[PDB]
Design a protein around this ligand. Structure first.
Ligand SMILES: Cc1cc2nc3c(=O)[nH]c(=O)nc-3n(C[C@H](O)[C@H](O)[C@H](O)COP(=O)(O)OP(=O)(O)OC[C@H]3O[C@@H](n4cnc5c(N)ncnc54)[C@H](O)[C@@H]3O)c2cc1C
Ligand SMILES: Cc1cc2nc3c(=O)[nH]c(=O)nc-3n(C[C@H](O)[C@H](O)[C@H](O)COP(=O)(O)OP(=O)(O)OC[C@H]3O[C@@H](n4cnc5c(N)ncnc54)[C@H](O)[C@@H]3O)c2cc1C
Ligand SMILES: Cc1cc2nc3c(=O)[nH]c(=O)nc-3n(C[C@H](O)[C@H](O)[C@H](O)COP(=O)(O)OP(=O)(O)OC[C@H]3O[C@@H](n4cnc5c(N)ncnc54)[C@H](O)[C@@H]3O)c2cc1C
Ligand SMILES: CNc1cnn(-c2cccc(C(F)(F)F)c2)c(=O)c1Cl
Ligand SMILES: CNc1cnn(-c2cccc(C(F)(F)F)c2)c(=O)c1Cl
Ligand SMILES: CNc1cnn(-c2cccc(C(F)(F)F)c2)c(=O)c1Cl
Lengths: 472, 467, 470
């Protein structure tokens, strides 16, 4: 769609935040023939996908990011930039750890010959160590009405927690604790007793819609260089501007209530025909002008609050003999998903030294604790996953170095009844627009959600071209 | 053809005989040269002093052998195949003398007849084992050609573990099937081999149905092909071993030099010999071409075919093939019951496949017969004793083939050559060549049909090269 | 903007040249050779004893501008061993004796040629010289339109019409006809001889001859392959094209190889001999004028004989020799003329056996016997048919029953341009429309002309690539 029409006069759109939402807004506005001015607060691109190179030349990330087959807007973007080969697709499997049997792992293998949802049904049927046959029947009974259900049905489930809905549908409490604790922490870094059922249903839709919807991929290197730079190069080649260390301090308003300019941290005033806030909901809420604060659209945002998360990186002296070229569900009380980045990531490949990147969730009682306290808790959990290779007192494998990245306000906490509060990309303020994973879009608080919100934002701006050009 | 091609074929096995048959049908002149004084190759048989036949192997014809069915029909010898009951009879190693079977109902179509057979059988698989086995195999049977080719990287034992098929099922059922198809255990055999064999059970209704030839293969099967080739102007010559592939200065074939020095020439040349013999006869100037260099992976597997004539007629026998489920033996049959020409009402003869034979091809005939009698004492405990206390051996025949069919180990499929070689005028035939029906009689016949097809496709280029 | 992927069938001089100039233009050629040797009709093979034997005795001329350019571009000019500016002919009437046409290096063209004929007294009488000069003067003064008009006559026919004595046609032109197309003047087109005689009047050293310093696959074909590969091009041996698979509109879908492999590109080139192309032309193309005309162009039989003798011949030349034999054409002592084939105590004779129509079917021993009988006339005090004198250590007989197209009269309108009426399909080879005959120069020029036509159609070939992508 972002090819049609060539503007008489291109719009100058000021975008606050160069995360995937801001980068996507800038990409599709540039494709439409407009001039985006992307202003990033930090000295790094990507936001919640940002990474940094330390003194030894090793990268550490904000988080462990997994790309799914059921990410259509991400697939389109990678294809449009011709970087499809930068996604390292792994085996169609879901490998889970055994808390009862340390060092042992169980898995759900999706046959490449069976279509969706048969490959999924088969994976559950074939697995014998994570679910009993009666549990499998009760689980299938509980989920069948949900999978047959439409979009109206999944929206109606936003009033329940995962634990609440599973009990109502008769799904055994052991299934919710065995399988769904892992899935809840993976999607929103919180347990099923807090997470909205609508979140799990959009995730389970990956398993029944497309055949490879639930198939996983790792980026071949650090996201700022391998993903963010191709978008920046594309935006700049079409006349767009991308500026780092440009934090917006204030949204200055005209007497009628519309935006006058975006005042930067050094006082610099940036103007445009349209203004976009592609910042996280927490930062936007603090920067909303007093005169907007009582408008329903901005007042509803009080429900959407960032969830704490910690991303731990540990470089070991040895190469671990028992590892996978995949993502692993630790099924730990302290950890969520983890991966041996020296095996899964191309740019992070090392044949004699293995690095483990792990998501530490729930992180509410841990974001305040010291890095050594977090590493100790991680090593204690790793001694359960690698009992013959990793010991907490470094008796076996030894830590060369570590990197603990804390995000106390990451993605919005997808608790029940957040969906009516989620704003559309077009705001009731003429000339002001919103972008970000938290905005109204159907693919959760994810990389796909961020990119889609950007596409939806750019779409709303080009739709209002006539009104935005006359206002200039 | 304006002018018929003279095609020189080396080896009168089923591949060479098939190449000659279909080239003669196309109106060309095949010259089939056989090294030995017998036709058939790995299906060859010999008549001893007492007038009794002994074979290279126990051969079973399947319903899922379309090119074999076509050939028999074309020669009008369909009645020479003795189709047995649609059953799979297996011995019980734990219960000596006892047998279990998978009966395929003739009213149920494929794969329902198969599903029923497994469901009905209660002594070879437990109900949980049946479920895990069905789960493990269902994605595979639904899979296409690209899927089965992707399984060539795994052994049978490896793939069964991955798909969650119980280890007891792999040891109970698949040891028997692996030794039957390629004379090796599932820890060595490629999974692609088992998947092509299991496709017999789900494609056609009678695909897994078995048949015995009504007599010795040289007379009952090879002679009808020879008579057909000769009636259309083709030549079939025994005791004509090719000693050398003589080349022209450009690298193409000049002639085939025989053992007595005789030079045989043609417009096209075919090698329908086993891969082991071809590898030794490849000229030095061809040896580094990918097509011929890849052949190093394909090596013949040892096998032994034992024949034992007993003084009595065994009271407990079948008009069928039996899976011994032995560590030394593979499939066996009472040929005095199953084969028409070998029928004897007072004297029963047992033809048994001795596999794996790696540690046995070097051993003496008496050592092999002793091991066979010790295994027969487990299958017939009230009729056969190793010290000949019960039934007594009148005579025996031990036929050893130390390099039979290629050992279908994982990753052999990319090495398998097409019937058309990169050398202009030179072609290959044989069960080892690129064809979808394994190293079998069907594979041999299909490779022959595919070879003859490639020669007639290149008629224009082969006729111009002659002048 | 985006380099074209051009699939070329055949790594002869035409295919190698097409690949070389497409790589120079910044495109990606994929050169597929059917055999395990490069060069085609210039291919050679090393036997067990380490001695090379060739498809033919190849002579490079000064009047080969595209060959000179290629050698210069690859920096291998020193690989051509230029011989004396002479034309040495044998005397059939006087066995062992030789006559020659010496071209003075002080006289320019065609004066050096006129002088050579005037100075020679044993091959032409003074009246014969006058009648020959009279008969040829209108022809040498004539333009390109004139030489094309002579394609309707045989050499024997035109010589009789222009009043050139019948003895001149039999003495001088039998040798020249067999040298250029391995056929006698009663069959060869006069246009062929006129393009050859143009070597003698255009450039001073046009008629000067050179031998390659070694085997052509290593000394000439490898430098081209190394150059193509260094610029991103692909060269693959044992890749015979089995079928030209077509799209529903008639254009090429892919080239199907002998091992089943399907090779695709933005453009497709057939640098194969005309005989092989004619057999591979799809049925739907067979009635198009361009491909139907090719029925006239048929490969001519030729035999290249190599004989290694026990002794080094005392009476030999560091040159090419015209045997003026009824069975043989040109010959050379390769132990003298070729650098890599040099041997001081053992001499090797490489001889062209033409006309070969009645000989390609005969045995190697039958051919060697006929060659030894003819060599007993050229070396009567050194070689005897019953090996009484010099003895054969070994021999190599290379038969090409369909070599260069038989340049009989009226073949010129049938010769195709490098750009075919099929969009994306192109032709290369000595038989295609180019002015330097069925020669090494013709092959290289056709390659240059093919690569030129492909780069000229870059815009149309790049757009067609993306239209199919949709
Ligand atoms: C530990 C972790 C693991 C994750 N795993 C996955 C996964 O497996 N799969 C998946 O799909 N998603 C995953 N995500 C989520 C994903 O990272 C986010 O959904 C997405 O990147 C958010 O996009 P965004 O553009 O809306 O916000 P952000 O990426 O956070 O971008 C906002 C940007 O605005 C900038 N900014 C802030 N204030 C200002 C200001 N005043 N002026 C200017 N700029 C400003 C920020 O610096 C930032 O660059 C994970 C996230 C984390 C933290
Ligand atoms: C014990 C045993 C049991 C078997 N059971 C079965 C079964 O149940 N079902 C089934 O389908 N298949 C079975 N087979 C396999 C089957 O026999 C073969 O797949 C098939 O016969 C091989 O065909 P072929 O023509 O390619 O090779 P071959 O039959 O081996 O033919 C090659 C021929 O070339 C000849 N030759 C060799 N060297 C030269 C030379 N230099 N010059 C000229 N001729 C030469 C040989 O003498 C031989 O006749 C069995 C094989 C064995 C040994
Ligand atoms: C005896 C002899 C003497 C000669 N003397 C001279 C001389 O003195 N001077 C001179 O200038 N010229 C001479 N020539 C002629 C010269 O060799 C040719 O004119 C020239 O080499 C032909 O070039 P070409 O590339 O078009 O064809 P070729 O060199 O014949 O190349 C065609 C190539 O295509 C390959 N091919 C065929 N089919 C397929 C397929 N299906 N798929 C893929 N590849 C395929 C062939 O293997 C070959 O390599 C002589 C030739 C001979 C035989
Ligand atoms: C912060 N959002 C995230 C974070 N992780 N995953 C995720 C990663 C791996 C595995 C899974 C799961 F399979 F559980 F769905 C989800 C997401 O799908 C989303 Cl939407
Ligand atoms: C040497 N090849 C062989 C040898 N035997 N059988 C065979 C014979 C009897 C039973 C079975 C089985 F039922 F196991 F497939 C296979 C083959 O199907 C092939 Cl392909
Ligand atoms: C097959 N083509 C050939 C073959 N040989 N010569 C050739 C070689 C030596 C001498 C002469 C002659 F002097 F006669 F022209 C021609 C050619 O000029 C061409 Cl075009």
């Amino acid at each position: 769609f972002r090819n049609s029409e060539q503007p008489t006069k291109p719009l100058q759109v000021v975008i606050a935040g160069a995360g995937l939402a801001g980068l996507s807004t800038a990409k599709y506005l540039a494709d439409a023939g407009h001039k985006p001015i992307l202003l990033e607060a930090r000295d790094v691109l990507g936001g919640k996908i940002a990474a940094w190179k330390d003194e030894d030349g090793d990268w550490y990330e904000t988080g462990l990011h997994i790309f799914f087959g059921a990410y259509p807007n991400i697939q389109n973007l990678f294809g449009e930039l011709g970087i499809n080969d930068r996604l390292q697709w792994k085996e169609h499997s879901m490998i889970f750890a055994m808390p009862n049997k340390p060092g042992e792992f169980s898995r759900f293998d999706f046959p490449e010959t069976l279509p969706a949802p048969l490959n999924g049904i088969w994976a559950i049927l074939r697995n014998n160590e994570m679910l009993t046959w009666p549990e499998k029947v009760k689980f299938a009974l509980g989920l069948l009405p949900a999978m047959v259900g439409g979009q109206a049905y999944v929206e109606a489930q936003d009033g329940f927690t995962v634990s609440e809905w599973m009990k109502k549908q008769g799904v055994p409490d052991r299934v919710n604790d065995e399988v769904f604790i892992a899935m809840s922490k993976a999607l929103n870094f919180i347990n099923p007793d807090e997470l909205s059922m609508q979140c799990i249903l959009i995730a389970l839709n990956r398993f029944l819609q497309e055949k490879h919807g639930s198939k996983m991929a790792f980026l071949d290197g650090n996201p700022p260089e391998r993903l963010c730079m191709p978008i920046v190069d594309h935006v700049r080649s079409l006349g767009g501007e991308v500026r780092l260390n440009s934090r917006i301090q204030k949204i200055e308003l005209n007497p009628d209530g519309t935006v006058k300019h975006f005042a930067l941290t050094d006082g610099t005033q940036i103007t445009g025909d349209a203004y976009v806030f592609a910042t996280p909901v927490d930062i936007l809420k603090l920067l909303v002008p007093q005169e907007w604060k009582e408008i329903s659209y901005f007042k509803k945002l009080e429900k959407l609050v960032g969830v704490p998360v910690i991303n731990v990186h540990i470089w070991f002296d040895r190469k671990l003999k028992n590892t996978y070229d995949h993502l692993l569900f630790s099924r730990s009380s302290l950890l969520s998903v983890y991966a041996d980045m020296s095996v899964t990531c191309k740019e992070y490949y090392d044949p004699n030294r293995s690095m483990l990147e792990l998501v530490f969730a729930p992180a509410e009682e841990w974001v305040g604790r010291s890095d050594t306290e977090i590493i100790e808790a991680t090593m204690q959990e790793l001694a359960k996953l690698f009992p013959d290779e990793i010991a907490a007192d470094q008796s076996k494998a030894k830590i060369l170095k570590y990197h603990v990245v804390k995000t106390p306000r990451s993605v919005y906490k997808t608790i029940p009844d957040c969906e009516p509060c989620r704003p559309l990309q077009r705001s009731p303020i003429e000339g002001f627009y919103l972008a970000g994973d938290y905005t109204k879009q159907k693919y959760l608080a994810s990389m796909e959600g961020a990119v889609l919100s950007g596409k939806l934002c750019a779409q709303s701006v080009v739709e209002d071209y006539k009104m935005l050009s006359r206002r200039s």
